[PDB]
Design an enzyme around this catalytic site. Structure first.
Site, PDB file in Angstrom:
ATOM      1  N   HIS A 195       0.859  -1.091  -0.072  1.00 48.99           N
ATOM      2  CA  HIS A 195      -0.064   0.111  -0.082  1.00 48.99           C
ATOM      3  C   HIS A 195       0.810   1.218   0.024  1.00 48.99           C
ATOM      4  O   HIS A 195       0.452   2.488  -0.029  1.00 48.99           O
ATOM      5  CB  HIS A 195      -1.027  -0.228   1.083  1.00 48.99           C
ATOM      6  CG  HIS A 195      -0.484   0.035   2.483  1.00 48.99           C
ATOM      7  ND1 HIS A 195      -0.041   1.233   3.069  1.00 48.99           N
ATOM      8  CD2 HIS A 195      -0.704  -0.788   3.495  1.00 48.99           C
ATOM      9  CE1 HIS A 195       0.399   0.974   4.192  1.00 48.99           C
ATOM     10  NE2 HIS A 195      -0.173  -0.259   4.715  1.00 48.99           N
ATOM     11  N   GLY A 210       2.505   6.352   9.498  1.00 54.00           N
ATOM     12  CA  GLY A 210       3.862   6.248   9.377  1.00 54.00           C
ATOM     13  C   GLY A 210       4.536   5.161   9.798  1.00 54.00           C
ATOM     14  O   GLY A 210       5.663   4.728   9.255  1.00 54.00           O
ATOM     15  N   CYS A 256       3.576   1.945   9.250  1.00 50.29           N
ATOM     16  CA  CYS A 256       3.649   0.877   8.359  1.00 50.29           C
ATOM     17  C   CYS A 256       4.777   0.272   7.768  1.00 50.29           C
ATOM     18  O   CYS A 256       5.842   1.319   7.653  1.00 50.29           O
ATOM     19  CB  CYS A 256       2.496   1.122   7.438  1.00 50.29           C
ATOM     20  SG  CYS A 256       0.763   1.221   7.890  1.00 50.29           S
TER      21      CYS A 256
END
Ligand SMILES: CCOc1cc2ncc(C#N)c(Nc3ccc(F)c(Cl)c3)c2cc1NC(=O)/C=C/CN(C)C
Ligand SMILES: CCOc1cc2ncc(C#N)c(Nc3ccc(F)c(Cl)c3)c2cc1NC(=O)/C=C/CN(C)C
Lengths: 306, 306
Positions: free
Chosen positions: B41, B143, B145
């Site tokens: 993503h 942030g 991830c």
């Protein structure tokens, strides 16, 4: 979202850990520049620890009696001295992994991360607070002495604790990196008992703010209080008295949430008087006091290091 | 003495963390040998996340669109591919800090350490468990991830988790390092809800053994039970059923303490039926289920890494 007991990344400190052996005793040391710091009781037998005369015991030790090993590689000891309750072993090689660092003596109520080590090798990392009675509630086995506690701000490691002793009641005592014990404790195996384990009120309030930020809000109520009223309750429950300095430190969390500090104090008062009725806050069934206001802001804001 | 929620030392993993930016989105990646792994993503807008077609979105991306930065130094991307829910970015330089490592898909009930990172920089380390409903209860902001979870055994880092998603209820979902989500979760912003948060019975029992080892013993009683009896109680309290496999795994802690597993089960049964009556165990007012039997033995025995 989410709020966890979080330690600082430990790599900067892992690169400073060494093994120190003197005769029959092995513990850990901290290698910064060309100095290795370790507990002076490395020179003692377990006989010696009942009533040691460290100055006399040290007379019989020479540089070559302090075996210092960084990983698989031996360090050459070119001098040694005693400073309060620590030894400083001068080695002929500066640690190439030395981070930017400072030595700090923390105040009761402040938190720090501990890198628990054995034989100079890291075992784990966890978060602790200097309790009001100057103990810490750590996790330390035989061989962990010389493990350190620290905080990091951007690239600078502030070392604040070196582990020395376990009291008969299972809590822990140690020094700053100048070798002065926190509290009244001494490096002898004697009758020393901890005083009252007071709860760190400002930290509990910070954690209640953390809870609100993360959606746990059932404990908010319709009440307020005053500093003097609230402290009558703090006293009964063996909480530290709340001061205006503490209120000021909670200013930023108050502003973020829109909850006045004294309103949060009124929530805490009801929690102390009524308990939690079987409910939880941030996954805890008790009031957590080992997050400082700065810890809450830091974790809730994503601050990084290296 | 002492028992703390303890994470693995994080230095080996800190040296693998990088920043990955694709267009407008920045998250973290894991740099091992000449591959950087990150959530797919990274290629999405926040528009895209409601219903993304990742294969179509990826068509518009070239190597030079993936900006990969290790500390202050840019890495050159020489290839990219999608594997399940992760991207693998081939770079022209092998990470000189690559530790010995493996990719492992953990089972529910197993624990691991998370190095929470932002912009490729470490923020903190904490311990988590894969819950029975395949969520984790972490601490993750926007942030984070691409932050990873891992275990260490001597010198080998077993990576088991990469962070992808926060559910509306504040818990967390992610993949293994092959990019397969734990549980039924998907990398789209949709209605996905977690199932029952069942308590990990074998871990609670392990922690009761840890408590006994450390001197907390008030919950020991005069009773025993059977697996089938105890499981009638486990079911009522939304505990996982205890199996003979679990009993066998608790063998070493049973042998160390001399407390038969089923006797400890009878203590747990009374705690579930009666509560804790305002008392604590290892500093907790609830029954802790994020220590495995191996975690207890490890922490109580001083095992080290590097
Ligand atoms: C991880 C992504 O970055 C952030 C995420 C956040 N998510 C939630 C909340 C909340 N709530 C934050 N801030 C925050 C505010 C005040 C509070 F008191 C509390 Cl607890 C939390 C956040 C802050 C972040 N980052 C910054 O604040 C950066 C600023 C740097 N400047 C000096 C240049
Ligand atoms: C830190 C100093 O070393 C130890 C300290 C200990 N302190 C307390 C207890 C306790 N209780 C320990 N062991 C232990 C036993 C069985 C249990 F189930 C539990 Cl929880 C704990 C300890 C084990 C240590 N070290 C070893 O066990 C090393 C062995 C290596 N060999 C394969 C070569």
């Amino acid at each position: 979202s989410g709020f966890r007991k979080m330690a600082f990344p430990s790599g900067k400190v892992e690169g400073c850990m060494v093994q120190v052996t003197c005769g029959t005793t092995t513990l850990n040391g901290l290698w910064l520049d060309d100095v290795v710091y370790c507990p002076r009781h490395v020179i003692c037998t377990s006989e010696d620890m009942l009533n040691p005369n460290y100055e006399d015991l040290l007379i019989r030790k020479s540089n070559h009696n302090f075996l210092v090993q960084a990983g698989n590689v031996q360090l050459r000891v070119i001098g040694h001295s005693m400073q309060n309750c620590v030894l400083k072993l001068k080695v002929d090689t500066a640690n190439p992994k030395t981070p930017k660092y400072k030595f700090v003596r923390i105040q009761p109520g402040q938190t720090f991360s501990v890198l628990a080590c054995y034989n100079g090798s890291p075992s784990g990392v966890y978060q602790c607070a200097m309790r009001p009675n100057f103990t810490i509630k750590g996790s330390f086995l035989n061989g962990s002495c010389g493990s350190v506690g620290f905080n990091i701000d951007y690239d600078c490691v502030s070392f604040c604790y070196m582990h020395h002793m376990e009291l008969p009641t299972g809590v822990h005592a140690g020094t700053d990196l100048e070798g002065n014990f926190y509290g009244p404790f001494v490096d002898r195996q004697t009758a020393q008992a901890a005083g009252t384990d007071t709860t760190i009120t400002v930290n509990v309030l910070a954690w209640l703010y953390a809870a609100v930020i993360n959606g746990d809000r059932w404990f908010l109520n319709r009440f307020t209080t005053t500093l003097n009223d609230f402290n009558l309750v703090a006293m009964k429950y063996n909480y530290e008295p709340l001061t205006q300095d503490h209120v000021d430190i909670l200013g930023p969390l108050s502003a973020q949430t829109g909850i006045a500090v004294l309103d949060m104090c009124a929530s805490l008062k009801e929690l102390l008087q009524n308990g939690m009725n079987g409910r939880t806050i941030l996954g805890s069934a008790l009031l957590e006091d080992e997050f400082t206001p700065f810890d809450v802001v830091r974790q809730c804001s994503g601050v990084t290091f290296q």
